[PDB]
Design a protein around this nucleic acid. Sequence first.
RNA 1: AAUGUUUGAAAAAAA
RNA 2: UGACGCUCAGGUGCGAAAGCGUGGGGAGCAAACAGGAUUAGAUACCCUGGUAGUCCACGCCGUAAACGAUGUCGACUUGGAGGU
Lengths: 102, 70
Amino acid sequence: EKSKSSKEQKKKQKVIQVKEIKFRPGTDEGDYQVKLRSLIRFLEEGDKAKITLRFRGREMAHQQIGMEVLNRVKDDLQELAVVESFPTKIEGRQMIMVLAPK
Amino acid sequence: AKEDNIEMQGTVLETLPNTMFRVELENGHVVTAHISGKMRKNYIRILTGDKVTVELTPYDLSKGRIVFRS
RNA sequence: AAUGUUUGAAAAAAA
RNA sequence: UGACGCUCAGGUGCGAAAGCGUGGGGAGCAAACAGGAUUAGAUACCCUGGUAGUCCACGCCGUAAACGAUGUCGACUUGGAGGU
Ligand SMILES: NC(=O)OC[C@@H](O)C[C@H](NC(=O)[C@H]1NCCC[C@H]1O)C(=O)N[C@@H](Cc1c[nH]cn1)C(=O)N[C@H](C(=O)O)[C@H](O)c1c[nH]c(Cl)n1
Ligand SMILES: [K+]
Ligand SMILES: [K+]
Ligand SMILES: [Mg+2]
Ligand SMILES: [Mg+2]
Ligand SMILES: [Mg+2]
Ligand SMILES: [Mg+2]
Ligand SMILES: [Mg+2]
Ligand SMILES: [Mg+2]
Ligand SMILES: [Mg+2]
């Protein structure tokens, strides 16, 4: 009971984890708001937020509709987060936007 | 012997429950279309953004039947 | 143990 | 003793736990809550704490899968094995 009472303050150094919220193209407004409120909670507390958008089947045709959702979350969390990386192509069947705390 | 329909192209703007769709047509009018029976039976999926042929009726220009998806 | 392709209408099945 | 019985709408009382009011009490436990995890998320399950409450008095509440899911009273109608 000596080194721990120093290493407690060294442990207090907050460990920023990435919190994954997955959207879809079809995601409705009410459910979008839940997921947005989840993202707000993370970015409020100084946690990074990976934001996937998954396509299924022939939704791969209409990619831009997926991009609208990812664009929208960026806009809603414009003053509460910065875009660490915005996606370009569908890697696999996903587009990942990692946000960061301000 | 039956009365004739009006075929017209349109984009699916949103999907609704139970194979119902909003479809903005060529002329710019948004109709609440439903899937054809033949497309239901043969399992042709329709999605938001898909270009669809829509059979309209003169009795109602707010409704249609999606008969083809391109 | 949110699990384990898409197509189908004018003719599909993982390969 | 000598039919004084049976049932009973309305009525009256009793009625687990939670809960409510007032005043006590408070070891353990523990809604809420706080922190730690888990996870795609985890407003949970898991971990460390923890307040009301759980306890007492008095008053209130009048509900439960308040179940034998079987109203009360009386008579009659083969058997077998147990318990008290
Ligand atoms: N988190 C999420 O969104 O999904 C992950 C979740 O599906 C994990 C999964 N969880 C469970 O079954 C729960 N059972 C009840 C007790 C708690 C928990 O355990 C699970 O497999 N657990 C493991 C332990 C674990 C948690 N995170 C990673 N691993 C586990 O050992 N589960 C046991 C089981 O499935 O039989 C059992 O439930 C158990 C014993 N001890 C604990 Cl703790 N859990
Ligand atoms: K009476
Ligand atoms: K307490
Ligand atoms: Mg009686
Ligand atoms: Mg009580
Ligand atoms: Mg009290
Ligand atoms: Mg405890
Ligand atoms: Mg606990
Ligand atoms: Mg009742
Ligand atoms: Mg009953």
